[PDB]
C-alpha cells in the first residue's frame, strides 16, 4: 500500500478564529515515524511549522509559529492534527502534512494532498 | 537599571462595576520575585490584598478580598494586574503594587508602586474653577507678601498643582482637599519677597487628570 | 520491549550505542553527524521534546573503538547505519545534552539555604502537611523515596508538590502541583529497604525559573571520589525527634565508602549495592526525619548530579551512623524506562 | 492567624531624642532563627519605605539611626537621634505565616518651639464673582501646635454658618504646621 | 535556526539547455541538503537528498552537489515536465527551506 496522508478538506474561518486541520495517515505504523506540518504561501515560498511524534507527543516548533500553532495527535484513531489560533490575513496557506522517512532520516518523502486554509 | 513598578492612573468608576489596576515591573528578572498588592483607605493604615507568583501564577487572596480582587500577571510584557469586582463606596482607596524579596523568603516588600487612587461614586465629573488670589494694598507691612490659588468644585481627587512651572517650590503650602457639599475644594499659598512679585511673574498651574483643566 | 540501546557516558554526555557483536559500548563519531539524529536519540531516552545541544568533544572516555556512520544507508535504525570503526576523520565524538540541568544560582547542623541554591528541591504534602521531599529532574518527573508512598499513601491524589518555595508557611493550597502518577520501585523491600526509589508525575509541567530547575541524573561512568563533596537539603527536623523545619536548610556532607560503612561498628553489611552512605562517621551532620527522598547532589564539570536520595538512618546526631541514600546511578535505567513508557 | 498590635497610636518627640515604637504579635513570629517582623515608613503622599526587615536587618539606603530589635512576640523600633524628616507613620508587618498583616501604625510628631500663625486675609478675586459664588480664605502659616482655632468678622460681625478648615502635615523642613479657613 | 539563502530568486531558462540554482546555509550542515520539486497543485516531490542521491524512479538528468555552506543543483536537457519551483531543504538542525526559484522556459 502506498503510504497515504489524507488531509481534511479546504476550510475557511473568520479572522481571530481557530482552525484545527487533520491529517489521517495510512499505510504505515502511525507510531513508528513522525509527522511534520509545512506552510506554503504565495510570495513567501515554503515554510516549516513543527513536528509531532505520535509515540510520545514530542513536539518541535519554529520560532515564528510558537503559540500560533498547537500540534496534536491521537494514536488510536491514527490521525494527527494541527490547531491554528487567532488566524489572520497572512495565515492563508496551503498547509502540507508530511511524514518524515524515519526518526534517523528526517526527510519529507511523503506529503499530504494539501488543505487550502483561507481566512475571511 | 534601578527597579521600578509603574501603576496606572486614578480611576473614577461607578458602583457595582469593576476596575483593573495594572503595575508594570521593570529593572529586574520579573519571574523571580513575588508581586504583592496592598490597600490603604485615606488615613486608615495598610491592608494586604494578596500576592501572585509571576513565574507560576499562584495567587493568595486574603480572606477579606477573596471573591473581590482577582490577581493576574502578564509575563510577556512584565506587568501585573489586579481586578476589583462589585465596586462599592468602601472599595475606594489607594492600591499599591509591591515586590517582595528575592525568593519571597522574608515576605517583605522592598519596592512599591506610586499608588492608584480609586474613587467609587455615581457623581458627575466637574471642572475646577481656579481663582487667582492676590494680597490687599492696605496690609503690605514689610516684605513678606503672600499669594496663592484656590480650586473649588472639581471632582474627583487628585489634581496636580504647580507654581511658576516648578520654578518656585520653597514655601509652597498645598493643603488637602475636602468634600464640601459633594465636591472637592483645594487651596494653596506661596510666600516671597515683595520686590519680586511686581518684577517677576508668579502664577499657579493646575492639571485635573479626569477632566483636563490647565488654567 | 528492550529499547535502552543508547546512552550518554560520564560528565561530558558522550553518546554511546551498544554492539552485540563486541558486547561493548562504543562512542559515536562526530563526523557527518546530523543534529536531528541527536534529537531522535534524546527522544529514544524519554525526553518530552527536551533537547539542549549537541557538540563534538575529543573523546574524554577510554574507548579505542568508535561507531562511524554510514551515510550511504537510508531509512534504518541508529544501530543499523552505524558501523564499527577504529578511528574518526575528526578527532571528536558526539556529546549529547538532552536537557538543561544541573545549574543552580551560585538537616541537623545545616545552615539555611538561600533561594535558587537548590532549585530542584521539592516538598511533598499529604494533608497540607509536609511528609518528605524529592528532586525535579524534568518539567514533569520527580525523584523521591519508595518508603514515602507506602500504603495507604500509594495513590496519586493524596500528594501535592511545592517546588520553588523555601518557606513551609507559604506552601498554601494552590501553590503546589497535583501528582498524576506515583511509580514506586517494584523491587522495594519494606522490611530491608534495598531498592528504595520512587517517581512522581504532575498534571501540569513545571515552569523553570531561577528558583526552579532540574538536577542532572548520573550518567554511567561518573568517576566519583571515595569521599566526594556532596550536598543535602530539606525541611527535616533540625533536632532528633524535633518538628519539621519552616525553612529549607542545607548541609555539606561527604560520601562514605561502602567498604567502610558496612563494618561491625557501622550498619554491619546491611548496605546493598543499591544504597550509598553519606555524612560523617564523627557525626554532627545527617538528614533527619522529614526530608526523605531529598537530593544528594554533587558538583562535577559545573553540573549537579542526583547522586542519591534519602532512604533511612539509625539516628541523626550520632557518630558511626551516616545517612543512607538510594543509588540513583543504579536506578537511572529504570527511571528512563518509566519516563519513556508514558502513555504506553 | 496573627494580629500585630502597634503602640502607641502616636508619639511626639523632640528633635535629637529617641523615639521607640513597639509592636507585639498574637503568637511568636520567630522560628528557625528568623524573626519575621518588618518595619516600614510612609510619608504623606508616598508609598511605604521598608526600613528594617527580619526584625534586625537594616535595608540598604536607610540611615543608621533606625534600629530594630526583638524576638518572639515583642519587637521595638528605635529612631535616635530623631530628625525632622522622621515625622511619618511607622508600620510593623509580620510575614511569619499567611495572610501577611500590618500594624495599625504610629504617627510620629516633632516637638518644637511654639510659633504663632502668620495670618493672611484674601477677599474674593474678580474671577470668583462672575459665577455668583462667594468664598473668603484665610491662610495660617508656620504655627505650632496644630490645635488652633479661628473665627470670622465679616463687616466686623461674627459669623459661623458654613465654615471649612484644612490642615497640612508637619513640614519636614521646619516641623511647623499650616491651616486654611474658608 | 540554520537560515538558508537560495538564489537566483527566479530564472527564465532555455528549454533543452542547462540551469543551476544556488543555495547557501548559515551553518555547516554536513551536506544534509535535499531538493524538492513543486508542481502547481501536485504537492512537492523529493528529488535529491544529501547532495549526491536521487530518490529512486527519478530522471538521472537531475543532480546536485556541494559542501560547507554553499550548495548547487543543476538539471540539463530541460523538458516541459521540469517547470517547477525547486526548493533546498536542510535537515541538519530542525528543518529549513530555501526561497524557491521559478524555472520558466524562454
Q: What is the 3-state secondary structure (H, E, C) of chain C?
A: CCCCCEEEECCCCEEEEEECCCCEEEEEECCCCCHHHHHHHHHCCCCCCCCCEEEEECCCCCCCCEEEECCCCCCCCCCCCEEEECCCCCCCEEEEECCCCCCCCCCECCCECCCCCCCCEEEEECCCCEEEEEEECCCCEEEECCHHHCCCCCCCCCCEEEECCCECCCCCCCCCEEEEEEEECCCCCCCCCCCCCEEEEECCCCCCCCCCCCCECCCCCCCCCCCCEEEEEECCECCCCCCECCECEEEEEEECCHHHHCCCCCCCCCCCCCEEEEECCCCCCECCCCCCCCEEEEECCCCEEEEEEEEECCCCCCCCCCEEEEEHHHHHHHHHHHHHCCCC
Determine, yes or no, domain membership for C66. Answer: yes
Question: Are B66 and B103 within one domain?
Answer: yes
**What are the residues whose beta carbons fall under 8 Å from the beta carbon of C56, sequence distance 6 or more?**
C30, C33, C90, C92, C93, C94, C95
Residue A65: closest CA among A84, A46, A89, A52? A84
Determine, yes or no, domain membership for A84. Answer: yes
CB C124 within 8 A of CB C154: no
Question: Could you tell me the sign of the dihedral formed by the alpha carbons of A106, A109, A112, A118, in that order?
Answer: positive
For chain D, the first-to-last Cα distance in angstroms comes to 47
A105 touches chain C (CB under 8 A): yes
Phi/psi at E42 (5° precision): -105, 15
Q: Which chains touch E (3 or more CB pairs under 8 A)?
A: A, C
Instruction: Based on DSSP, count helices (H) and strands (E) in chain A, helices before strands.
Output: 0, 10
Give the integer Cα–Cα distance in Å for A1 and A27.
6
**What are the residues whose beta carbons fall under 8 Å from the beta carbon of C163, sequence distance 6 or more?**
C119, C120, C121, C122, C123, C136, C177, C206, C212
Phi/psi at C225 (5° precision): -65, 160
Taking phi over 0 as left and psi of -120 to 50 as alpha, with beta for the rest, C234 belongs to left
H/E element holding A101? Answer: strand A94-102
Range list for CATH 2.60.40.10 in chain D: 5-111, 120-181
Which residues, in sequence order, are bridge partners of residue E96?
E90
Give the integer Cα–Cα distance in Å for C77 and C32.
16
Specify the number of domains making up chain C: 2
Coil/strand/helix, residue D74: strand
Coil/strand/helix, residue B90: helix
Tell me whether residues C175 and B104 touch, CB distance under 8 A: no
E5 touches chain A (CB under 8 A): no
Give the integer Cα–Cα distance in Å for B131 and C73.
92
Q: Which chains touch A (3 or more CB pairs under 8 A)?
A: C, E
Chain B residues inside the 8 Å CB shell of D123: 136
For residue C57, the enclosing domain spans 6-97
Chain A residues inside the 8 Å CB shell of E98: 45
Residue C322: closest CA among C284, C295, C291, C290? C284
Q: Take residue C127 and report the three cell numbers written for it.
A: 494533608
Domain boundary among B120, B140, B169: B120
Q: What angle do CA B62, B64, B67 make, to 5 degrees?
A: 90
Question: Are B57 and B140 within one domain?
Answer: no
Residue to mutate among C118, C139, C165, with most B CBs inside 10 A, is C165
Tell me whether residues A60 and C37 touch, CB distance under 8 A: no
H/E element holding D106? Answer: strand D106-111
Computed on alpha carbons and rounded to an integer, the radius of gyration of chain A in Å comes to 14
Tell me whether residues A105 and C48 touch, CB distance under 8 A: no
CB A10 within 8 A of CB A19: no
D47 touches chain B (CB under 8 A): yes
D42 touches chain B (CB under 8 A): yes
**What are the residues whose beta carbons fall under 8 Å from the beta carbon of E26, sequence distance 6 or more?**
E1, E2, E3, E4, E5, E69
Give the integer Cα–Cα distance in Å for C309 and C144.
7
B53 touches chain C (CB under 8 A): yes
Strands D177-181 and E33-38: unpaired
Residue E23: closest CA among E96, E95, E73, E74? E73
H/E element holding D69? Answer: strand D66-71
Tell me whether residues B133 and D125 touch, CB distance under 8 A: yes
Question: Are B15 and B116 within one domain?
Answer: yes
Query: What's B154's domain CATH number?
Result: 2.60.40.10
Give the integer Cα–Cα distance in Å for B130 and B45.
32
Q: Take residue B208 and report the three cell numbers written for it.
A: 485635573
Chain D residues inside the 8 Å CB shell of C174: none
Question: Are B154 and B108 within one domain?
Answer: no
E38 touches chain A (CB under 8 A): yes
Question: Are B102 and B50 within one domain?
Answer: yes
Q: Judge residue B182's burial from the number of C-beta atoms within 10 Å of its C-beta, 0-12 exposed, 13-18 middle, 19 or more buried.
A: exposed
CB A11 within 8 A of CB A19: yes
Determine, yes or no, domain membership for B212. Answer: no
For chain A, the first-to-last Cα distance in angstroms comes to 38
For residue A63, the enclosing domain spans 11-107
Which residues of C have a catalytic role annotated?
147, 196, 292
User: How determined?
Assistant: cryo-EM
> Which CATH code fits D5-111?
2.60.40.10
Which one of C170, C172, C245 has the shortest CB-CB distance to D32?
C245
Q: Cell 495594572 identifies what position?
A: B22
Q: Which chains touch B (3 or more CB pairs under 8 A)?
A: C, D
The residue in chain D having the minimum alpha-carbon distance to the alpha carbon of residue C109 is D32
Return the CATH fold of E4-105.
Answer: Immunoglobulin-like (2.60.40)
Give the integer Cα–Cα distance in Å for D46 and D85.
13
Query: What's C45's domain CATH number?
Result: 3.10.250
> Which CATH code fits D120-181?
2.60.40.10
Give the integer Cα–Cα distance in Å for D37 and C321.
39
Question: Are B44 and B24 within one domain?
Answer: yes
For residue B153, the enclosing domain spans 129-207
H/E element holding B197? Answer: helix B196-199
Determine, yes or no, domain membership for B213. Answer: no
Determine, yes or no, domain membership for C321. Answer: no
Give the integer Cα–Cα distance in Å for B74 and B83.
13
Give the integer Cα–Cα distance in Å for C200 and C212.
16
Long-range contact pairs involving B4-7 (C-beta distance under 8 Å, separation at least 24): B4/B111, B5/B35, B5/B97, B5/B98, B5/B99, B5/B111, B5/B112, B5/B113, B6/B113, B6/B114, B7/B95, B7/B96, B7/B97, B7/B113, B7/B114, B7/B115, B7/B116
Query: What's C174's domain CATH number?
Result: 2.40.10.10
Distance of CA B145 to the CA centre of its chain: 31
Phi/psi at E28 (5° precision): -90, 105
Tell me whether residues C169 and D32 touch, CB distance under 8 A: no
Q: Cell 524555472 identifies what position?
A: E103
Specify the number of domains making up chain A: 1
What is the least distance, in Å, from the CA of A45 to any CA of chain E? 6
Determine, yes or no, domain membership for B27. Answer: yes
Q: Take residue B194 and report the three cell numbers written for it.
A: 515683595
D120 touches chain B (CB under 8 A): yes
Residue C15: closest CA among C72, C70, C55? C55
Amino acid at each position: 500500500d502506498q503510504v497515504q496522508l489524507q488531509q481534511s478538506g479546504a476550510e475557511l474561518a473568520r479572522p481571530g478564529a481557530s482552525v484545527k486541520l487533520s491529517c489521517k495517515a495510512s499505510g504505515y505504523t502511525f507510531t513508528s515515524c513522525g509527522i511534520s506540518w509545512v506552510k506554503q504561501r504565495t510570495g513567501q515560498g515554503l515554510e516549516w511549522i513543527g513536528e509531532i511524534y505520535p509515540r510520545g507527543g514530542n513536539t518541535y516548533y519554529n520560532e515564528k509559529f510558537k503559540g500560533k500553532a498547537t500540534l496534536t495527535a491521537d494514536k488510536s484513531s491514527s490521525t494527527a492534527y494541527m490547531e491554528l489560533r487567532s488566524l489572520t490575513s497572512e495565515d492563508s496557506a496551503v498547509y502540507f502534512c508530511a511524514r518524515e522517512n524515519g526518526n534517523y532520516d528526517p526527510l519529507f518523502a511523503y506529503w499530504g494532498q494539501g488543505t487550502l486554509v483561507t481566512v475571511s | 537599571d534601578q527597579v521600578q513598578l509603574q501603576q496606572s492612573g486614578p480611576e473614577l468608576v461607578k458602583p457595582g462595576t469593576s476596575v483593573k489596576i495594572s503595575c508594570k515591573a521593570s529593572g529586574y528578572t520579573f519571574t523571580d520575585y513575588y508581586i504583592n498588592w496592598v490597600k490603604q483607605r485615606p488615613g486608615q493604615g495598610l491592608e494586604w490584598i494578596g500576592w501572585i507568583f509571576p513565574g507560576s501564577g499562584s495567587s493568595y487572596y486574603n480572606a477579606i478580598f477573596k471573591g473581590k480582587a482577582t490577581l493576574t500577571v502578564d509575563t510577556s510584557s512584565n506587568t501585573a494586574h489586579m481586578s476589583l469586582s462589585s465596586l462599592t463606596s468602601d472599595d475606594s482607596a489607594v492600591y499599591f503594587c509591591a515586590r517582595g524579596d528575592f525568593g519571597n523568603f522574608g515576605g517583605f516588600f522592598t519596592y512599591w508602586g506610586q499608588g492608584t487612587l480609586v474613587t467609587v461614586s455615581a457623581a458627575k465629573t466637574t471642572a475646577p474653577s481656579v481663582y487667582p488670589l492676590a494680597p490687599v494694598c492696605g496690609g503690605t507691612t514689610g516684605s513678606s507678601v503672600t499669594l496663592g490659588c484656590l480650586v473649588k468644585g472639581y471632582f474627583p481627587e487628585p489634581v496636580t498643582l504647580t507654581w511658576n512651572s516648578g520654578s518656585l517650590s520653597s514655601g509652597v503650602h498645598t493643603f488637602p482637599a475636602l468634600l464640601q457639599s459633594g465636591l472637592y475644594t483645594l487651596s494653596s499659598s506661596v510666600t516671597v519677597t515683595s520686590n519680586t512679585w511686581p518684577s517677576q511673574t508668579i502664577t499657579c498651574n493646575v492639571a485635573h487628570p479626569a477632566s483636563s483643566t490647565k488654567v | 520491549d528492550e529499547n535502552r540501546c543508547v546512552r550518554l557516558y560520564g560528565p561530558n554526555f558522550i553518546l554511546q550505542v551498544y554492539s552485540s557483536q563486541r558486547k561493548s559500548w562504543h562512542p559515536v563519531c562526530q563526523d557527518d553527524w546530523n543534529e536531528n539524529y541527536g534529537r531522535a536519540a534524546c527522544r529514544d531516552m524519554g525526553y518530552k521534546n527536551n533537547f539542549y545541544s549537541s557538540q563534538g568533544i575529543v573523546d574524554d572516555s577510554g574507548s579505542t573503538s568508535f561507531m562511524k556512520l554510514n551515510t550511504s544507508a537510508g531509512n534504518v535504525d541508529i544501530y543499523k547505519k552505524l558501523y564499527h570503526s577504529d578511528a574518526c576523520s575528526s578527532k571528536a565524538v558526539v556529546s549529547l545534552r538532552c536537557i538543561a540541568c544541573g545549574v543552580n544560582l551560585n538537616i541537623v547542623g545545616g545552615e539555611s539555604a538561600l533561594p535558587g541554591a537548590w532549585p530542584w528541591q521539592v516538598s511533598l504534602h499529604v494533608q497540607n502537611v509536609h511528609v518528605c521531599g524529592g528532586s525535579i529532574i524534568t518539567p514533569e518527573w520527580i525523584v523521591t523515596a519508595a518508603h514515602c508512598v507506602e500504603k495507604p499513601l500509594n495513590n496519586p491524589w493524596h500528594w501535592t508538590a511545592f517546588a520553588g518555595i523555601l518557606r513551609q508557611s507559604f506552601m498554601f493550597y494552590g501553590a503546589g502541583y497535583q501528582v498524576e502518577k506515583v511509580i514506586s520501585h517494584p523491587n522495594y523491600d519494606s522490611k530491608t529497604k534495598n531498592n528504595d526509589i520512587a517517581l512522581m508525575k504532575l498534571q501540569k509541567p513545571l515552569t523553570f525559573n531561577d528558583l526552579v530547575k532540574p538536577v542532572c541524573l548520573p550518567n554511567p561512568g561518573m568517576m566519583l571520589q571515595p569521599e566526594q563533596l556532596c550536598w543535602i537539603s530539606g525541611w527535616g527536623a533540625t533536632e532528633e525527634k524535633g518538628k519539621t523545619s519552616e525553612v529549607l536548610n542545607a548541609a555539606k556532607v561527604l560520601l562514605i565508602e561502602t567498604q567502610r560503612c558496612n563494618s561491625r561498628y557501622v550498619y554491619d553489611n546491611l548496605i546493598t549495592p543499591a544504597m550509598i552512605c553519606a555524612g560523617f562517621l564523627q557525626g554532627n551532620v545527617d538528614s533527619c526525619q522529614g526530608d526523605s527522598g531529598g537530593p544528594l547532589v554533587t558538583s562535577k564539570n559545573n553540573i549537579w548530579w542526583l547522586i542519591g536520595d534519602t532512604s533511612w538512618g539509625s539516628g541523626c546526631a550520632k557518630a558511626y551512623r551516616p545517612g543512607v541514600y538510594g543509588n540513583v546511578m543504579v536506578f537511572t535505567d529504570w527511571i528512563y524506562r518509566q519516563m519513556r513508557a508514558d502513555g504506553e | 492567624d496573627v494580629v500585630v498590635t502597634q503602640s502607641p497610636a502616636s508619639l511626639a518627640v523632640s528633635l535629637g531624642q529617641r523615639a521607640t515604637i513597639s509592636c507585639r504579635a498574637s503568637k511568636s513570629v520567630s522560628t528557625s532563627g528568623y524573626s519575621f517582623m518588618h518595619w516600614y515608613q510612609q510619608k504623606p503622599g508616598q508609598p511605604p519605605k521598608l526600613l528594617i526587615y527580619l526584625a534586625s536587618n537594616l535595608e540598604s539606603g536607610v540611615p543608621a539611626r533606625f534600629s530594630g530589635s526583638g524576638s518572639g512576640t515583642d519587637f521595638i523600633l528605635n529612631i535616635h537621634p530623631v530628625e525632622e524628616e522622621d515625622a511619618a507613620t511607622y508600620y510593623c508587618q509580620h510575614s511569619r505565616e499567611l495572610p501577611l498583616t500590618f500594624g495599625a501604625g504610629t504617627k510620629l510628631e516633632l516637638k518644637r518651639a511654639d510659633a504663632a500663625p502668620t495670618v493672611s486675609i484674601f477677599p474674593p478675586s474678580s474671577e470668583q464673582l462672575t459665577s455668583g459664588g462667594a468664598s473668603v480664605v484665610c491662610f495660617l502659616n508656620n504655627f505650632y501646635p496644630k490645635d488652633i482655632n479661628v473665627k470670622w468678622k465679616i463687616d466686623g460681625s461674627e459669623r459661623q454658618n458654613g465654615v471649612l478648615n484644612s490642615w497640612t502635615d508637619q513640614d519636614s523642613k521646619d516641623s511647623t504646621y499650616s491651616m486654611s479657613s474658608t
